[PDB]
């Protein structure tokens, strides 16, 4: 019967679609590894997808996935156990070393570009026309950690130009240098900006930006990662 043929045919199609979808979702992270870094014997029942290639805009080269995969950075961690399935403990300061919830990825040390090739993220002071249009303006307000002490004052907002949104708060410390705090890790209030993640003394630990009018994808990961890592690692204060 024709409905029987339709339904049975669809289940064949759906198993084929799932298979394709799961291999499409193996273009990063695979092949799986043992805990010592070497390739694992068991890789699951779905095969590695055969490579594809994205041509990146603005002369940025090309990404091939899947392909040669490394962390290309030191991982300060040590095995907790002989067998598999156990945690790996930080050998050092996990916040400054970039592990666990303080982790970052070795992304390209260049800034994200919009469609006309200019920097995507710029401080509002170097962004002709940009102003706070609604809600509380945080510029000039004290920045307060979770030990309730003042780490500094907000001196600017770094905006995603194409999307028109506030991404970071540039904060001046005791010593006069500045750091970027992601906007989704702050609570702007009528008389201060509160950062639950970090205590005041730990803001200097936030990695710094090389150039003062641009931020690279590598620096953003280092920054974002370090701040969110504070939720675990600064917590005992």
């Amino acid at each position: 019967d024709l409905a029987s043929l339709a339904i049975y045919s669809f289940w064949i199609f759906l198993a084929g679609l799932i298979y394709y979808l799961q291999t499409e979702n193996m273009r990063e992270g695979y092949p799986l590894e043992n805990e010592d870094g070497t390739p694992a014997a068991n890789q699951g029942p779905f095969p590695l997808p055969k490579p594809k290639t994205f041509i990146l805009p603005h002369g940025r080269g090309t990404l091939t996935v899947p392909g040669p995969e490394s962390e290309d950075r030191p991982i300060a961690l040590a095995r907790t156990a002989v067998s598999e399935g156990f945690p790996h403990a930080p050998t050092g300061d996990p916040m400054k070393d970039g592990v666990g919830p303080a982790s970052w990825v070795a992304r390209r040390d260049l800034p994200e570009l919009d469609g006309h090739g200019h920097n995507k993220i710029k401080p509002m002071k170097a962004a002709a026309g940009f102003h706070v249009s609604a809600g509380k303006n945080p510029i000039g307000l004290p920045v307060r950690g979770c030990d309730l002490e003042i780490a500094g004052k907000v001196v600017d907002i770094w905006v995603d130009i194409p999307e028109q949104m506030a991404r970071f708060l540039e904060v001046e410390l005791k010593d006069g240098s500045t750091r970027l705090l992601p906007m989704q890790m702050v609570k702007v209030q009528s008389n201060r900006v509160h950062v639950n993640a970090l205590s005041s003394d730990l803001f200097a630990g936030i990695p710094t930006i090389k150039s003062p009018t641009e931020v690279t994808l590598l620096e953003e990961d280092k920054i974002c990662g370090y701040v969110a890592g504070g939720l675990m690692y600064a917590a005992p204060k």
């Binding site: 992270g29 799986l32 490394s70 962390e71 666990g100 303080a102 194409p162 999307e163 949104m165 969110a228």
Partner: protein, 281 residues
């Protein structure tokens, strides 16, 4: 085994209960206290389904159905065979879902991300609890709840619906469907858009977010943006399930008639209600 980038994230910490006792993985799966709790509740609920199946005299998953107690039991416990197995399986289901959620929270803490996912999964849980717990309690009996079987639960939806005429007329059911339909529409569009920028026309460089914005501006005169759309998808899906729960918690508790009667608050209103013409006059 591990993903190539996973090792650096497999640190101790994040647990709410048990300290470091259950702080480990089985293969890919994180365990935690709530992983052993999930397993205990899921193990026990599955064993009780299989017991219900030996009692029903079938192994066919198409036919296995665990019915809740008859209405005459009210909110009392019932003997295993006559609704007691449903009651225990429901308790086990509830403890598994809540434990799964709390386990997601532990996983969130270890990875230092927001708690948006378990907060969201909680709406599904509340919808389940509406059909299985809240509505039955307000209505006076566990028997008003749905039976656990692949086809028998559909018949429950049919019988419950047709108790109130066409259930389409439930105004909160209309809002929920609107949110469901709009959700799938939105998911299709977002999935397409990202894919259309990442996988552009042959002989073209990968597109930027500006292209995504420009496409939705050209087509519709408005782009909600990358943050906005993921906000929107979350809002739509959650709203759909919230108005699902709402439309059921009011059915048979503060509303008892055919749902089509609701709409007379508009038709039979005194001033235009008499006027000759139209459909209802």
């Amino acid at each position: 085994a591990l993903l190539s980038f996973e090792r650096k994230y497999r640190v101790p910490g994040g647990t709410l209960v048990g300290g470091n006792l259950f702080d480990f993985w089985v293969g890919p799966f994180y365990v935690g206290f709530f992983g052993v709790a999930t397993f205990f509740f899921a193990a026990l609920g599955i064993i009780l389904i299989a017991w219900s199946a030996v009692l029903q005299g079938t192994w066919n998953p198409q036919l296995i159905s665990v019915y809740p107690p008859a209405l005459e039991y009210g909110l009392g416990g019932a003997p295993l065979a006559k609704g007691g197995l449903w009651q225990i399986i429901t308790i086990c289901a509830t403890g598994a879902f809540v434990s799964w959620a709390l386990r997601e929270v532990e996983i969130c803490r270890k990875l230092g991300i927001g708690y948006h996912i378990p907060f969201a999964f909680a709406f599904a849980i509340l919808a389940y609890l509406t059909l299985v717990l809240f509505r039955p309690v307000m209505m006076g009996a566990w028997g008003y709840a749905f039976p656990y079987g692949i086809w028998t639960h559909l018949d429950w939806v049919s019988n419950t619906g047709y108790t109130y005429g066409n259930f389409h007329y439930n105004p909160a059911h209309m809002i929920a469907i609107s949110f469901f339909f709009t959700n799938a529409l939105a998911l299709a569009l977002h999935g397409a858009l990202v894919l259309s920028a990442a996988n552009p026309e042959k002989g073209k460089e990968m597109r930027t977010p500006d292209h995504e914005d420009t496409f939705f501006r050209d087509l519709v005169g408005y782009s909600i943006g990358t943050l906005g759309i993921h906000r929107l998808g979350l809002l739509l899906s959650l709203s759909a399930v919230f108005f699902s729960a709402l439309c059921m918690i009011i059915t048979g508790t503060i509303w008892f008639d055919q749902w089509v009667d609701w709409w007379q608050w508009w038709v039979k209103l005194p001033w235009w209600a008499n006027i000759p013409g139209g459909i209802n006059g």
